[PDB]
Design a protein around this ligand. Structure first.
Ligand SMILES: *[C@@H]1O[C@H](CO)[C@@H](O[C@@H]2O[C@H](CO)[C@@H](O[C@@H]3O[C@H](CO)[C@@H](O)[C@H](O)[C@@H]3O)[C@H](O)[C@H]2NC(C)=O)[C@H](O)[C@H]1NC(C)=O
Lengths: 119, 188, 106
């Protein structure tokens, strides 16, 4: 089974940091890109950015610059995300997604979502 | 009424250099300082106009031509140059106003195993006229007895596929080239 | 960015009639627009990549149409397992932009 397995939930304080892993199993990790999508509760999906497995370059959206840092470890086939300096309005579900193709960026295989609740 | 520079520079799939795209930019307000002060482009050499005074002029029609070439071939996107891109794919005239934007896109156009999506014309009977494209796919010379629609020895297919891999050096890495061509409808 | 607007915000159709879900794009995204299905609680699930290609494991009732700045997702016969929030996503231009979603209700 092709899968993207994420970590568990989180309960942090404002100003803290949380480390969310997204482990890829069932496919060759370097061939396909990893995209991070954030969904606030009672709100639509909202794209954060992506990271290249075979180049290592992260790319961020318009709002998710600064506090949010993507990273990955190629050998154990997983991708991470730094939420440095958590604020109150970051309570959201954070998905990791897999790209169908290089030019067909439709997220065919998703993660399970890590509910980062901050208060 | 901003000019749609954001759908020329942001497109996910650029076109190959043999079938290079072309966009009419007209009847809008163009801000060129946001492209100068972007710190993303490896090449923004401008010919016939200075880039710091680009936000004050007014042009009649603006063409934006986008294609992907090799990294060691962005020098051929220049007025009066010679190569296999300027001869057979994309020729710029000598009296060329408007200018050329290139940035590295190894993050976007490189695939492990070979990204054979972009093709460049390798073999064509004559050099290209300026701002002319040749999307036809027909077999080359037949100096001997004709090809008859079949490839092989001494009959060559004109289009050669680029191979882009992330392990290539800077020069085999894919570069995304945008060629603005100027002349009033497009002001600053 | 390419603002993708979905009308209506919610639609109610009886269990068995055609439901059409419109997604209007700010710019011409070509035919590069994916349709997702987020059932409540689960991850979003890809349905149609571009207007021809359907996903793996998707029912055959889901059909896409339209190109340019007007895209409709048409469910032929609504079941009880197709009650979710459907997001359209363009991928013609960076950054990739999602829609607002359309809560389909019986
Ligand atoms: C193509 O990509 C560029 C770069 O990502 C996009 O430029 C961005 O455009 C948006 C809206 O046009 C800008 O947002 C604006 O920011 C100002 C200042 O924060 C704010 O006052 C406005 O209300 C608006 O939110 C954004 O700053 C700008 N980013 C950069 C780096 O220039 C462009 O929109 C993309 N085009 C398409 C068609 O996707």
């Amino acid at each position: 089974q092709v899968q993207l397995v994420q970590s568990g939930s989180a309960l942090k304080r404002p100003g803290a940091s949380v480390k969310l892993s997204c482990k890829a199993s069932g496919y060759t990790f370097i061939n396909y890109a990893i995209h991070w999508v954030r969904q606030a509760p009672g709100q639509g999906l909202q794209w954060m950015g992506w990271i290249n497995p075979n180049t290592g370059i992260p790319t961020y959206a318009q709002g998710f610059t600064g506090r949010f840092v993507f990273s990955l470890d190629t050998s154990v086939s997983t991708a991470y995300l730094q939420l440095s300096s958590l604020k109150i309005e970051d309570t959201a579900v954070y998905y990791c997604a897999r790209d169908q193709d290089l030019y067909e960026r439709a997220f065919d295989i998703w993660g399970q979502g890590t509910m980062v609740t901050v208060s | 009424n901003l000019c749609p520079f954001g759908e020329v520079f942001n497109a996910t799939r650029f076109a190959s250099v043999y079938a290079w795209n072309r966009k009419r930019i007209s009847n809008c307000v163009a801000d060129y300082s946001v492209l100068y002060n972007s710190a993303s482009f490896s090449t923004f050499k401008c010919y016939g106009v200075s880039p710091t005074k680009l936000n004050d002029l007014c042009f009649t029609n603006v063409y934006a031509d986008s294609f992907v070439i090799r990294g060691d071939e962005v020098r051929q996107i220049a007025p009066g140059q010679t190569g296999k891109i300027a001869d057979y794919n994309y020729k710029l005239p000598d009296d060329f106003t408007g200018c050329v934007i290139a940035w590295n896109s190894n993050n976007l156009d490189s695939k492990v195993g070979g990204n054979y999506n972009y093709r460049y014309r390798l073999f064509r009977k004559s050099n290209l006229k300026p701002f002319e494209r040749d999307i036809s796919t027909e077999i080359y010379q037949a100096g001997s007895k004709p090809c008859n629609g079949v490839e092989g020895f001494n009959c060559y297919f004109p289009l050669q596929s680029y191979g882009f891999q992330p392990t290539n050096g800077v020069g085999y890495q894919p570069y995304r080239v945008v060629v603005l061509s100027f002349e009033a409808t497009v002001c600053g | 960015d390419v603002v993708l607007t979905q009308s209506p915000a919610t639609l109610s159709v009886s269990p068995g009639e055609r439901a059409t879900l419109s997604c209007r794009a700010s710019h011409n995204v070509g035919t590069s627009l994916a349709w997702y299905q987020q059932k409540p609680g689960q991850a979003p699930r890809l349905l149609i990549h571009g207007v021809s290609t359907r996903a793996t494991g998707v029912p055959a009732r889901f059909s896409d149409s339209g190109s340019g700045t007007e895209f409709t997702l048409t469910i032929s016969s609504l079941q009880s397992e197709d009650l979710a929030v459907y997001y359209c996503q363009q991928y013609n231009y960076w950054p990739l932009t999602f829609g607002g979603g359309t809560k389909v209700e019986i």
